[PDB]
């Protein structure tokens, strides 16, 4: 629902390239492999943790109560 | 920028406006918008026995919506009918004319129960919901719709297949049972089932209201056909191989010395059951036997018996073809000879009869206030309206919750109608829609109905099964189908007329079995002289649009007949039309599909593409790919991978595989768990298992782009080294990471609700 | 090659058609009963070809014509659309004659003729 | 393939026009079906045996049928070589409409692609009608196992 | 609400029929490992291929091996998708190999494998079959109060 | 040779599918020789020997006359002449012939005469009479002349009866066999049922693989025994 | 391109006349047109639309006495018996100088083979011991009302044509 | 259509096969499968 | 014989004429054929 911290099969962090991964695509943007490389994720492991990433925290929190 | 590779953007813009619900969502449609008009009018007044003046008859109906109102009335929104445990349902308010003292009243929008309304219908209020509104009304926007709630439980009304109703089929085995069905139905107007058996090497005619069964050639004496030389025309032809089988039956009619439509009359008159009522005689009884009892759906209303009589013939015809060759018989599990029943259909079935028992109930009601006294003080008769408005409502809900179907009137007692929705996945909730159920789920064979035709190229989905006790009798429809809707046919027999046939009541008896007959709905109608001009002619007005599609035409050449259905339950699938030997759709047609004009059913009314039945598709040979046309090509395939259905799109590289393989996963991929809705953490169900980090596929599918799997999706993409280590992954085990599961590979959830209630009681 | 095996004999109906229609001619009391379309286009006001191609009777005379082309063929034009014809019923084995009924008090049936033949016309779609 | 494409078709022109001989226990259709059907079943021989005695030594499904493990060299060679004759209930596809098989093929085709003898192997990837002639004879052997 | 992680006995699969248990949990510096480090979530028997006739899955795995080097998706969709001599193109350009097949070291012993190993991501999705709720057992417990039996 | 192949070997079925009676021949080389001995077991219905069935209605005499050939005699090699047939109709007496009215016309012909309504009994006689069985045995459905792997003649009788089957000569009844097992029970006793039993099971398995222990077969031979 | 254009006319309705269709007798003999059933005592049933012919066969040539005579009560006559149902677009056409002349019919009558005298024998053989169903109701109560025969009627050849002028 | 006393005794859920020769045992659990190819065969 | 009369076309069932010649006629219908000498074929 929201990004891992770790990739799986190294444990390199990548929960803090999620914020920046969108950044390099929206704005300045980039071929989603470039922008890949530019945050620094070599290992194919790693790449299939953002890249396949479907980011549903966005559209559970449309049904909260509104509080 | 356009070519042979982008035909299939099409398969978009027909999935746009339809959908994959649209066979319970249109269903639902067309009964809340034509089918309450057509049960109203069926049964309008009310009769009071007593005192035979007050009388009372339903003007209209409407359900949802009062006529004095200029909004719709508010709903309790469906997932607070979930959760409440309610039944999202809509009032129906019909208005009523009656008569009160000594004047006649109008009285507006009485409400006579209340319906269970599907969702994303039109009376639901997700209709046309913007996705900010499905957000404030707890509603996923990806969820499909297409199914009811009633008691907080959601439950689907499967797609039921039955034989086709009104047609003839010729069965035959070893030791001579070649029985000829024909289950006529007209609503219930009557709902009978004829045969045909030889026994003997003597054709008769069973049929359930008969004591004993009669023979062949005393039944068409009994119609107008009476020469004796014509039912040697009618049966046999020219055909000298025919004429021996039939000579039999010939002269066991001279052997009951019957030789006049009087005489012939005369001896099923005294072969019926259920005499009750008029006491009438058996010239009056076996005249009324060929009229309303026999083949229903062929009513006669007048002394011409003609073409009941070509009906009966034609039925006999295609025995004594069967006797003299044992192998033209008539496969039961071919696609074109089934009808789809869905759920506008049954809910039909059902509301109707719920509205003869309401009727019933309150005839036997209207005049227990009519014989008592205070006859000077008269009653308005609409405060005993709501004495059993609370059975519409509560045998509706009933048949729906339970499944069960008890239809007094109609005489069906089916059972496992609807089902529980799926919510183990995304893919549940969309595989438990185009869903079909079938009719052989009481009696076993083998190797029957289980084996997959390949008449269902397209029409259904040739993988998406289950394995075990039910392979082959649940089954599941493609993308790109649609179920043809029933529509008139005294318009398409009154053009058939005017394009060239000659009536039955005009065409030589002796010279019938020379030219092709045409049979608009399997009943003999006329006699053309040059059939693929007027079948030519007859598509053309369907590609302009004059004639409606799902309106299907095909040229038989073994039985020399031109066929013409129009009936509803069968199931289509678009194709493109290819011209001399080159594809109608061009690359300008693409260019303009792409950038927003232009859609589907545009490419139906300017000619480009084209519904095809299961039928039809005999009268065609198709293209799959574009360098495959040759010109005696007639039809192109839009998409080839709609060969497979909703779930099994979700395979990747299918034809790869081997084809159990496919089936396997069809059942687990309704199985895997990930994620359900986006209302998934506002919704209490009864059982909930989701997944932590669910991740799309990294090999996809234009069959999960198109259903938005990769938006829910139930799984994780994990780095597969694929060896033998450690021995203990065996037999189908395998090795796990313990450094993936501490980080969150394949953590799930579980969710489960329990609920009491706080009853209070009569204490 | 079935759809030349009927443009043949329709080919063949034509000059079939030819001969049973002059061969008739000024035979006294002698009939052909023949088939046109239910809906006619109006001649008050000539609906277009079209027009009449789209929604598919007291009538005064000279309302079409029957053309003969000069290949092989024939077709009835009636006002302003344009049909096709063929004797296209079967070769009758049934024998047909034609009688006139009289209403109330001259009652009387009046055997007019005795049908050659019949043949169709469909609007050209 | 070709060559037994070539003599399936040097055969049924032999049989449009009544001509062919027959063996005393059939008919000119079934002798058709045995004639047609045995000389298919020879190419998956055929070619089959190019494909296994071409696979290299430490092969995977090579060793795996060599042992004894999971694995047959026919297997192997439908992976590799012709997938082969699709056969329902020891007949070949059945005309599952009016006088074809498909409405993709012609009406009165007995050719080899329109039967049932589908050519792809699994790496090559089953064509449309390959497709579906295969998963007919899957289900009545899903079936069978029930 | 109750959250459970992989035990011995759930059953995970494949998008290609191939069910599977689960056998045992690896501790990570076990399992076998390449030249960038990287070690495999699941280990998949060889002996469920041949049997089965799953030549999809693998190229499943070099679709998904080449797209996620590239950073695309890639498609493998039915009669057609992406195809497996422009996804070996993508895989020699970064300097893996064509076939999918790498060298992994062993992480028990530290040598080379003896073979290349088929090595990539494929799509698992976890069963709702979990062994948490299949294990049970009864020494004693209730009667049907009409036969006496358990 | 199914599972239900064992299944009615396991039940006595008295009617089984497919009861095909094999068939040793004293001439195993000549292939006429073969064809005689066939005809002489293969029933023979009349509408293979006759040209056709017809009935003729002179002034008060009223006769089904049918007409066969030699032309098929000596093709298929029959022992069978004109005056049996004549007998063989009269023999079956499904049809009610009060058979001293046959007459026989020189060498080619058959006159059935009747006499006392009289015309649907004889158009009962017209359809019933050419399909009678003229030569050969009437449980008999067919028969194929077979060729052994060593080049020998043992055709494939598939009827019921193997009583006249082991005694139409040219067959030697010493070495001829039957699948059915109850059939077998009635003409060559019990001991040859329970040693036909133990050998069309290892014969119906053998096909399959399932090489189970022949003990285990013999302990089936003789509960049923 | 065509060469010749024949004035097909139409005529007026003011006739309401039928056609019959005599299912037993055949057109043709010897290629030549077989004969007219020449004489005939014709009657008509409005309201039930019920068409009976009555012609007389030939004696002396196949036609047994004793079998007419004792259970018949004497016939020699057939009344033949169809319904007069509509059919439209049908127009009848004679040719008159290269001029065809529609005229509607308007009813179309499948003349059958129809026994009487069974039904003789079916009330004075028992009485010694002794929706559409409406449809046969309403016909079995009218008389049918006779019609004189006509044949050989050319003031109709001349009456479309007084009528087509304007 | 309700039960008699042969209708307690008849099908496989009755009496003779569901409560004679097949029933409910105790001491028994049922567990899903899993491999070990370190203990022995026994 | 399966050979119908004229004029109603119902079929010739032959009869022994009063115990005397064999003629053909059928019944409903006063026709007859007397001294026939008919015949058929089937093959
Ligand atoms: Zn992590
Ligand atoms: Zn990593
Ligand atoms: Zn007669």
């Given at each position: 629902?929201?990004?891992?911290?770790?990739?799986?099969?190294?444990?390199?962090?990548?929960?803090?390239?999620?914020?920046?991964?969108?950044?390099?695509?929206?704005?300045?943007?980039?071929?989603?492999?470039?922008?890949?490389?530019?945050?620094?994720?070599?290992?194919?492991?790693?790449?299939?943790?953002?890249?396949?990433?479907?980011?549903?925290?966005?559209?559970?929190?449309?049904?909260?109560?509104?509080? | 920028?356009?070519?042979?590779?982008?035909?299939?953007?099409?398969?978009?813009?027909?999935?746009?406006?339809?959908?994959?619900?649209?066979?319970?969502?249109?269903?639902?449609?067309?009964?809340?918008?034509?089918?309450?008009?057509?049960?109203?009018?069926?049964?309008?007044?009310?009769?009071?026995?007593?005192?035979?003046?007050?009388?009372?008859?339903?003007?209209?109906?409407?359900?949802?919506?009062?006529?004095?109102?200029?909004?719709?009335?508010?709903?309790?929104?469906?997932?607070?009918?979930?959760?409440?445990?309610?039944?999202?349902?809509?009032?129906?308010?019909?208005?009523?004319?009656?008569?009160?003292?000594?004047?006649?009243?109008?009285?507006?929008?009485?409400?006579?129960?209340?319906?269970?309304?599907?969702?994303?219908?039109?009376?639901?209020?997700?209709?046309?919901?913007?996705?900010?509104?499905?957000?404030?009304?707890?509603?996923?926007?990806?969820?499909?719709?297409?199914?009811?709630?009633?008691?907080?439980?959601?439950?689907?009304?499967?797609?039921?297949?039955?034989?086709?109703?009104?047609?003839?089929?010729?069965?035959?085995?070893?030791?001579?049972?070649?029985?000829?069905?024909?289950?006529?139905?007209?609503?219930?107007?009557?709902?009978?089932?004829?045969?045909?058996?030889?026994?003997?090497?003597?054709?008769?005619?069973?049929?359930?209201?008969?004591?004993?069964?009669?023979?062949?050639?005393?039944?068409?004496?009994?119609?107008g056909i009476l020469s004796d030389l014509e039912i040697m025309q009618l049966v046999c032809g020219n055909d000298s191989?025919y004429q021996?089988?039939?000579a039999?039956?010939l002269?066991?009619?001279?052997?009951?010395?019957?030789?006049?439509?009087?005489?012939?009359?005369?001896?099923?008159?005294?072969?019926?059951?259920?005499?009750?009522?008029?006491?009438?005689?058996?010239?009056?009884?076996?005249?009324?036997?060929?009229?309303?009892?026999?083949?229903?759906?062929?009513?006669?209303?007048?002394?011409?018996?003609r073409?009941?009589a070509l009906?009966?013939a034609?039925?006999?015809?295609?025995?004594?073809?069967?006797?003299?060759?044992?192998?033209?018989?008539?496969?039961?599990?071919?696609?074109?000879?089934?009808?789809?029943?869905?759920?506008?259909?049954?809910?039909?079935?059902?509301?109707?009869?719920?509205?003869?028992?309401?009727?019933?109930?309150?005839?036997?009601?209207?005049?227990?206030?009519?014989?008592?006294?205070?006859?000077?003080?008269?009653?308005?008769?609409?405060?005993?309206?709501?004495?059993?408005?609370?059975?519409?409502?509560?045998?509706?809900?009933?048949?729906?919750?339970?499944?069960?179907?008890?239809?007094?009137?109609?005489?069906?007692?089916?059972?496992?109608?609807?089902?529980?929705?799926?919510?183990?996945?995304?893919?549940?909730?969309?595989?438990?829609?185009?869903?079909?159920?079938?009719?052989?789920?009481?009696?076993?064979?083998?190797?029957?109905?289980?084996?997959?035709?390949?008449?269902?190229?397209?029409?259904?989905?040739?993988?998406?099964?289950?394995?075990?006790?039910?392979?082959?009798?649940?089954?599941?429809?493609?993308?790109?189908?649609?179920?043809?809707?029933?529509?008139?046919?005294?318009?398409?027999?009154?053009?058939?007329?005017?394009?060239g046939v000659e009536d039955i009541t005009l065409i030589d008896s002796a010279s019938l079995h020379l030219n092709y007959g045409?049979?608009?709905?399997?009943?003999?109608?006329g006699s053309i002289r040059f059939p693929?001009?007027?079948?030519?002619?007859?598509?053309?007005?369907?590609?302009?649009?004059?004639?409606?599609?799902?309106?299907?035409?095909?040229?038989?050449?073994?039985?020399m007949?031109?066929?013409?259905?129009?009936?509803?339950?069968?199931?289509?699938?678009?194709?493109?039309?290819?011209?001399?030997?080159?594809?109608?759709?061009?690359?300008?047609?693409?260019?303009?599909?792409?950038?927003?004009?232009?859609?589907?059913?545009?490419?139906?009314?300017?000619?480009?593409?084209?519904?095809?039945?299961?039928?039809?598709?005999?009268?065609?040979?198709?293209?799959?790919?574009?360098?495959?046309?040759?010109?005696?090509?007639?039809?192109?395939?839009?998409?080839?991978?709609?060969?497979?259905?909703?779930?099994?799109?979700?395979?990747?590289?299918?034809?790869?595989?081997?084809?159990?393989?496919?089936?396997?996963?069809?059942?687990?991929?309704?199985?895997?768990?990930?994620?359900?809705?986006?209302?998934?953490?506002?919704?209490?169900?009864?059982?909930?298992?989701?997944?932590?980090?669910?991740?799309?596929?990294?090999?996809?599918?234009?069959?999960?782009?198109?259903?938005?799997?990769?938006?829910?999706?139930?799984?994780?993409?994990?780095?597969?080294?694929?060896?033998?280590?450690?021995?203990?992954?065996?037999?189908?085990?395998?090795?796990?990471?313990?450094?993936?599961?501490?980080?969150?590979?394949?953590?799930?959830?579980?969710?489960?609700?329990?609920?009491?209630?706080?009853?209070?009681?009569?204490? | 090659?079935?759809?030349?095996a009927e443009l043949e004999l329709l080919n063949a109906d034509h000059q079939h058609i030819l001969r049973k229609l002059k061969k008739m001619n000024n035979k006294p009391e002698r009939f052909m009963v023949f088939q046109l379309?239910?809906?006619?286009?109006?001649?008050?006001?000539?609906?277009?070809?079209?027009?009449?191609?789209?929604?598919?009777?007291?009538?005064?005379?000279?309302?079409?014509?029957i053309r003969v082309h000069?290949?092989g063929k024939l077709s009835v034009?009636?006002?302003?659309?344009?049909?096709d014809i063929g004797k296209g019923a079967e070769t009758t084995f049934l024998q047909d004659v034609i009688a006139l009924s009289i209403?109330?008090?001259?009652?009387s049936a009046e055997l007019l003729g005795r049908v050659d033949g019949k043949i169709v016309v469909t609007?050209?779609? | 393939?070709?060559?037994?494409?070539?003599?399936?078709?040097?055969?049924?022109?032999?049989?449009?026009?009544?001509?062919?001989?027959?063996?005393?226990?059939?008919?000119?259709?079934?002798?058709?079906?045995?004639?047609?059907?045995?000389?298919?079943?020879?190419?998956?021989?055929?070619?089959?045996?190019?494909?296994?005695?071409?696979?290299?030594?430490?092969?995977?499904?090579?060793?795996?049928?060599?042992?004894?493990?999971?694995?047959?060299?026919?297997?192997?060679?439908?992976?590799?070589?012709?997938?082969?004759?699709?056969?329902?209930?020891?007949?070949?596809?059945?005309?599952?409409?009016?006088?074809?098989?498909?409405?993709?093929?012609?009406?009165?085709?007995?050719?080899?692609?329109?039967?049932?003898?589908?050519?792809?192997?699994?790496?090559?990837?089953?064509?449309?009608?390959?497709?579906?002639?295969?998963?007919?004879?899957?289900?009545?052997?899903?079936?069978?196992?029930? | 609400?109750?959250?459970?992680?992989?035990?011995?006995?759930?059953?995970?699969?494949?998008?290609?029929?191939?069910?599977?248990?689960?056998?045992?949990?690896?501790?990570?510096?076990?399992?076998?490992?390449?030249?960038?480090?990287?070690?495999?979530?699941?280990?998949?028997?060889?002996?469920?291929?041949?049997?089965?006739?799953?030549?999809?899955?693998?190229?499943?795995?070099?679709?998904?091996?080449?797209?996620?080097?590239?950073?695309?998706?890639?498609?493998?969709?039915?009669?057609?998708?992406?195809?497996?001599?422009?996804?070996?193109?993508?895989?020699?350009?970064?300097?893996?190999?064509?076939?999918?097949?790498?060298?992994?070291?062993?992480?028990?012993?530290?040598?080379?494998?003896?073979?290349?190993?088929?090595?990539?991501?494929?799509?698992?999705?976890?069963?709702?079959?979990?062994?948490?709720?299949?294990?049970?057992?009864?020494?004693?417990?209730?009667?049907?109060?009409?036969?006496?039996?358990? | 040779?199914?599972?239900?192949?064992?299944?009615?070997?396991?039940?006595?079925?008295?009617?089984?599918?497919?009861?095909?009676?094999?068939?040793?021949?004293?001439?195993?080389?000549?292939?006429?020789?073969?064809?005689?001995?066939?005809?002489?077991?293969?029933?023979?219905?009349?509408?293979?020997?006759?040209?056709?069935?017809?009935?003729?209605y002179?002034?008060?005499?009223?006769?089904?006359?049918?007409?066969?050939?030699?032309?098929?005699?000596?093709?298929?090699?029959?022992?069978?002449?004109?005056?049996?047939?004549?007998?063989?109709?009269?023999?079956?007496?499904?049809?009610?012939?009060?058979?001293?009215?046959?007459?026989?016309?020189?060498?080619?012909?058959?006159?059935?005469?009747?006499?006392?309504?009289?015309?649907?009994?004889?158009?009962?006689?017209?359809?019933?009479?050419?399909?009678?069985?003229?030569?050969?045995?009437?449980?008999?459905?067919?028969?194929?002349?077979?060729?052994?792997?060593?080049?020998?003649?043992?055709?494939?009788?598939?009827?019921?009866?193997?009583?006249?089957?082991?005694?139409?000569?040219?067959?030697?009844?010493?070495?001829?066999?039957?699948?059915?097992?109850?059939?077998?029970?009635?003409?060559?006793?019990?001991?040859?049922?329970?040693?036909?039993?133990?050998?069309?099971?290892?014969?119906?398995?053998?096909?399959?693989?399932?090489?189970?222990?022949?003990?285990?077969?013999?302990?089936?031979?003789?509960?049923?025994? | 391109?065509?060469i010749e254009?024949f004035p097909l006319k139409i005529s007026?309705?003011?006739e309401?006349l039928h056609v019959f269709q005599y299912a037993n007798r055949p057109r043709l003999v010897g290629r030549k047109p077989a004969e007219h059933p020449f004489i005939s005592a014709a009657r008509y049933?409005?309201?039930?639309?019920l068409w009976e012919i009555d012609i007389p066969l030939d004696e002396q040539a196949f036609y047994n006495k004793?079998?007419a005579?004792?259970?018949?009560?004497?016939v020699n006559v057939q009344t033949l018996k169809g319904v007069g149902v509509?059919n439209?677009g049908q127009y009848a056409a004679f040719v008159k100088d290269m001029q065809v002349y529609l005229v509607p019919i308007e009813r179309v009558a499948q003349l059958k083979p129809f026994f009487?005298?069974?039904?003789?024998?079916?009330?004075?053989?028992?009485?010694?011991?002794?929706?559409?169903?409406?449809?046969?109701?309403?016909?079995?109560?009218?008389?049918?009302?006779?019609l004189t025969w006509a044949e050989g009627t050319f003031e109709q050849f001349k009456d479309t044509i007084?009528?087509?002028?304007? | 259509?309700?039960?008699?006393?042969?209708?307690?005794?008849?099908?496989?859920?009755?009496?003779?096969?569901?409560?004679?020769?097949?029933?409910?045992?105790?001491?028994?659990?049922?567990?899903?499968?899993?491999?070990?190819?370190?203990?022995?065969?026994? | 014989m399966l050979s119908f009369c004229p004029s109603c076309n119902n079929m010739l069932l032959i009869?022994?004429?009063?115990?005397?010649?064999?003629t053909l006629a059928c019944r409903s219908c006063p026709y007859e054929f007397p001294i026939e000498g008919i015949e058929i074929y089937?093959?």
């Amino acid at each position: 629902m929201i990004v891992p911290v770790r990739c799986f099969s190294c444990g390199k962090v990548v929960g803090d390239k999620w914020e920046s991964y969108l950044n390099l695509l929206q704005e300045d943007e980039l071929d989603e492999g470039t922008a890949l490389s530019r945050l620094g994720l070599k290992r194919y492991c790693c790449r299939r943790m953002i890249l396949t990433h479907v980011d549903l925290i966005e559209k559970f929190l449309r049904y909260n109560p509104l509080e | 920028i356009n070519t042979a590779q982008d035909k299939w953007h099409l398969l978009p813009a027909f999935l746009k406006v339809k959908g994959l619900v649209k066979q319970h969502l249109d269903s639902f449609n067309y009964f809340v918008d034509t089918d309450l008009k057509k049960i109203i009018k069926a049964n309008q007044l009310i009769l009071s026995d007593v005192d035979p003046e007050f009388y009372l008859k339903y003007v209209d109906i409407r359900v949802g919506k009062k006529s004095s109102s200029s909004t719709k009335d508010y709903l309790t929104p469906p997932h607070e009918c979930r959760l409440r445990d309610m039944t999202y349902s809509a009032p129906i308010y019909v208005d009523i004319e009656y008569t009160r003292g000594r004047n006649i009243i109008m009285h507006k929008d009485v409400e006579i129960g209340r319906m269970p309304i599907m969702l994303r219908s039109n009376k639901c209020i997700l209709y046309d919901a913007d996705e900010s509104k499905m957000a404030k009304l707890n509603e996923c926007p990806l969820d499909p719709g297409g199914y009811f709630i009633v008691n907080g439980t959601e439950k689907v009304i499967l797609v039921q297949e039955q034989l086709s109703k009104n047609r003839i089929i010729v069965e035959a085995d070893e030791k001579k049972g070649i029985v000829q069905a024909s289950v006529t139905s007209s609503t219930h107007e009557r709902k009978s089932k004829t045969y045909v058996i030889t026994k003997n090497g003597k054709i008769y005619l069973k049929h359930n209201s008969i004591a004993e069964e009669i023979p062949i050639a005393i039944v068409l004496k009994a119609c107008g056909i009476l020469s004796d030389l014509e039912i040697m025309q009618l049966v046999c032809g020219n055909d000298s191989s025919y004429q021996d089988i039939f000579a039999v039956n010939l002269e066991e009619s001279s052997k009951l010395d019957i030789y006049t439509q009087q005489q012939a009359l005369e001896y099923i008159g005294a072969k019926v059951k259920t005499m009750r009522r008029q006491k009438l005689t058996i010239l009056q009884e076996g005249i009324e036997a060929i009229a309303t009892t026999v083949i229903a759906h062929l009513t006669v209303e007048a002394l011409d018996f003609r073409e009941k009589a070509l009906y009966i013939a034609m039925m006999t015809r295609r025995v004594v073809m069967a006797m003299y060759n044992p192998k033209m018989i008539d496969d039961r599990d071919y696609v074109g000879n089934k009808r789809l029943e869905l759920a506008g259909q049954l809910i039909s079935l059902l509301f109707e009869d719920l509205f003869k028992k309401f009727n019933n109930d309150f005839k036997l009601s209207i005049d227990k206030v009519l014989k008592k006294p205070n006859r000077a003080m008269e009653y308005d008769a609409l405060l005993s309206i709501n004495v059993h408005s609370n059975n519409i409502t509560s045998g509706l809900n009933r048949a729906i919750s339970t499944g069960n179907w008890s239809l007094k009137r109609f005489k069906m007692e089916r059972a496992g109608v609807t089902h529980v929705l799926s919510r183990l996945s995304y893919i549940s909730a969309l595989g438990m829609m185009t869903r079909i159920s079938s009719q052989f789920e009481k009696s076993r064979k083998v190797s029957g109905p289980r084996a997959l035709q390949p008449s269902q190229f397209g029409m259904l989905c040739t993988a998406d099964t289950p394995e075990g006790e039910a392979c082959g009798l649940v089954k599941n429809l493609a993308l790109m189908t649609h179920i043809t809707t029933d529509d008139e046919e005294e318009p398409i027999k009154k053009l058939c007329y005017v394009l060239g046939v000659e009536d039955i009541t005009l065409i030589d008896s002796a010279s019938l079995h020379l030219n092709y007959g045409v049979y608009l709905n399997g009943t003999l109608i006329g006699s053309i002289r040059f059939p693929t001009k007027f079948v030519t002619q007859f598509r053309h007005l369907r590609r302009t649009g004059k004639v409606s599609e799902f309106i299907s035409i095909y040229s038989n050449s073994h039985q020399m007949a031109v066929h013409i259905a129009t009936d509803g339950g069968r199931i289509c699938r678009p194709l493109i039309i290819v011209s001399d030997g080159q594809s109608r759709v061009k690359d300008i047609h693409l260019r303009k599909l792409l950038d927003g004009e232009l859609d589907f059913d545009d490419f139906l009314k300017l000619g480009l593409v084209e519904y095809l039945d299961v039928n039809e598709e005999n009268d065609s040979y198709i293209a799959l790919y574009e360098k495959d046309i040759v010109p005696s090509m007639t039809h192109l395939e839009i998409e080839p991978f709609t060969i497979l259905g909703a779930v099994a799109g979700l395979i990747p590289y299918p034809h790869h595989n081997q084809s159990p393989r496919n089936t396997y996963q069809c059942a687990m991929g309704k199985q895997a768990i990930g994620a359900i809705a986006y209302n998934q953490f506002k919704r209490i169900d009864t059982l909930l298992y989701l997944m932590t980090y669910p991740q799309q596929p990294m090999v996809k599918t234009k069959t999960i782009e198109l259903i938005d799997y990769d938006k829910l999706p139930a799984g994780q993409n994990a780095t597969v080294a694929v060896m033998s280590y450690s021995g203990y992954d065996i037999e189908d085990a395998l090795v796990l990471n313990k450094s993936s599961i501490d980080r969150g590979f394949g953590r799930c959830e579980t969710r489960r609700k329990t609920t009491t209630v706080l009853k209070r009681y009569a204490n | 090659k079935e759809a030349a095996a009927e443009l043949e004999l329709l080919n063949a109906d034509h000059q079939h058609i030819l001969r049973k229609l002059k061969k008739m001619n000024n035979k006294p009391e002698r009939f052909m009963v023949f088939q046109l379309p239910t809906r006619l286009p109006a001649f008050e006001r000539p609906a277009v070809k079209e027009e009449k191609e789209d929604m598919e009777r007291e009538l005064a005379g000279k309302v079409g014509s029957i053309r003969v082309h000069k290949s092989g063929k024939l077709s009835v034009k009636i006002g302003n659309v344009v049909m096709d014809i063929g004797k296209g019923a079967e070769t009758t084995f049934l024998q047909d004659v034609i009688a006139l009924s009289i209403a109330d008090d001259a009652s009387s049936a009046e055997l007019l003729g005795r049908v050659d033949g019949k043949i169709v016309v469909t609007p050209q779609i | 393939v070709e060559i037994a494409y070539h003599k399936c078709d040097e055969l049924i022109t032999l049989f449009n026009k009544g001509e062919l001989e027959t063996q005393p226990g059939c008919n000119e259709e079934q002798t058709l079906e045995a004639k047609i059907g045995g000389l298919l079943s020879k190419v998956r021989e055929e070619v089959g045996d190019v494909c296994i005695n071409e696979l290299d030594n430490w092969n995977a499904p090579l060793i795996m049928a060599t042992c004894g493990s999971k694995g047959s060299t026919l297997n192997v060679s439908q992976m590799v070589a012709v997938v082969g004759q699709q056969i329902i209930s020891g007949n070949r596809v059945p005309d599952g409409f009016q006088d074809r098989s498909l409405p993709h093929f012609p009406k009165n085709s007995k050719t080899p692609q329109s039967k049932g003898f589908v050519r792809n192997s699994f790496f090559s990837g089953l064509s449309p009608p390959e497709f579906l002639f295969h998963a007919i004879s899957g289900r009545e052997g899903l079936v069978d196992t029930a | 609400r109750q959250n459970r992680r992989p035990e011995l006995g759930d059953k995970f699969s494949s998008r290609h029929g191939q069910k599977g248990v689960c056998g045992i949990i690896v501790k990570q510096e076990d399992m076998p490992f390449n030249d960038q480090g990287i070690v495999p979530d699941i280990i998949m028997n060889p002996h469920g291929f041949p049997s089965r006739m799953t030549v999809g899955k693998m190229i499943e795995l070099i679709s998904g091996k080449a797209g996620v080097l590239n950073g695309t998706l890639e498609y493998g969709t039915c009669f057609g998708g992406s195809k497996l001599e422009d996804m070996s193109k993508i895989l020699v350009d970064q300097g893996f190999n064509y076939s999918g097949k790498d060298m992994l070291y062993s992480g028990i012993t530290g040598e080379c494998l003896q073979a290349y190993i088929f090595f990539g991501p494929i799509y698992y999705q976890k069963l709702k079959h979990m062994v948490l709720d299949k294990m049970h057992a009864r020494a004693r417990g209730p009667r049907a109060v009409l036969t006496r039996q358990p | 040779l199914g599972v239900p192949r064992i299944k009615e070997i396991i039940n006595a079925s008295k009617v089984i599918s497919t009861p095909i009676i094999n068939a040793v021949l004293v001439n195993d080389n000549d292939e006429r020789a073969a064809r005689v001995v066939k005809g002489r077991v293969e029933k023979t219905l009349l509408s293979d020997v006759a040209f056709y069935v017809q009935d003729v209605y002179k002034d008060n005499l009223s006769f089904i006359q049918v007409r066969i050939d030699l032309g098929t005699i000596d093709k298929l090699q029959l022992e069978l002449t004109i005056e049996d047939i004549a007998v063989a109709i009269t023999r079956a007496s499904k049809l009610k012939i009060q058979a001293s009215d046959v007459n026989i016309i020189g060498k080619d012909r058959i006159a059935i005469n009747v006499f006392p309504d009289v015309f649907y009994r004889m158009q009962q006689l017209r359809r019933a009479l050419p399909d009678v069985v003229v030569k050969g045995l009437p449980d008999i459905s067919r028969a194929v002349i077979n060729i052994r792997d060593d080049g020998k003649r043992e055709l494939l009788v598939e009827g019921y009866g193997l009583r006249d089957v082991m005694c139409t000569d040219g067959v030697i009844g010493s070495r001829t066999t039957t699948n059915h097992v109850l059939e077998v029970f009635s003409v060559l006793g019990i001991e040859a049922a329970r040693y036909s039993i133990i050998r069309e099971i290892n014969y119906t398995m053998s096909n399959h693989g399932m090489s189970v222990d022949p003990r285990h077969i013999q302990l089936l031979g003789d509960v049923m025994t | 391109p065509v060469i010749e254009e024949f004035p097909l006319k139409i005529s007026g309705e003011e006739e309401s006349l039928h056609v019959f269709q005599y299912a037993n007798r055949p057109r043709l003999v010897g290629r030549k047109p077989a004969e007219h059933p020449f004489i005939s005592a014709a009657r008509y049933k409005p309201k039930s639309h019920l068409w009976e012919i009555d012609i007389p066969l030939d004696e002396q040539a196949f036609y047994n006495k004793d079998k007419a005579e004792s259970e018949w009560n004497g016939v020699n006559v057939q009344t033949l018996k169809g319904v007069g149902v509509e059919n439209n677009g049908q127009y009848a056409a004679f040719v008159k100088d290269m001029q065809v002349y529609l005229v509607p019919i308007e009813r179309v009558a499948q003349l059958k083979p129809f026994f009487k005298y069974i039904d003789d024998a079916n009330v004075t053989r028992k009485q010694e011991d002794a929706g559409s169903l409406l449809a046969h109701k309403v016909a079995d109560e009218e008389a049918n009302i006779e019609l004189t025969w006509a044949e050989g009627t050319f003031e109709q050849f001349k009456d479309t044509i007084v009528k087509e002028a304007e | 259509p309700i039960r008699g006393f042969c209708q307690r005794l008849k099908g496989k859920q009755g009496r003779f096969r569901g409560n004679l020769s097949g029933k409910r045992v105790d001491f028994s659990g049922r567990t899903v499968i899993s491999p070990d190819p370190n203990l022995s065969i026994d | 014989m399966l050979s119908f009369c004229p004029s109603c076309n119902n079929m010739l069932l032959i009869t022994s004429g009063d115990s005397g010649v064999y003629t053909l006629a059928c019944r409903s219908c006063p026709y007859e054929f007397p001294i026939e000498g008919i015949e058929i074929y089937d093959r």
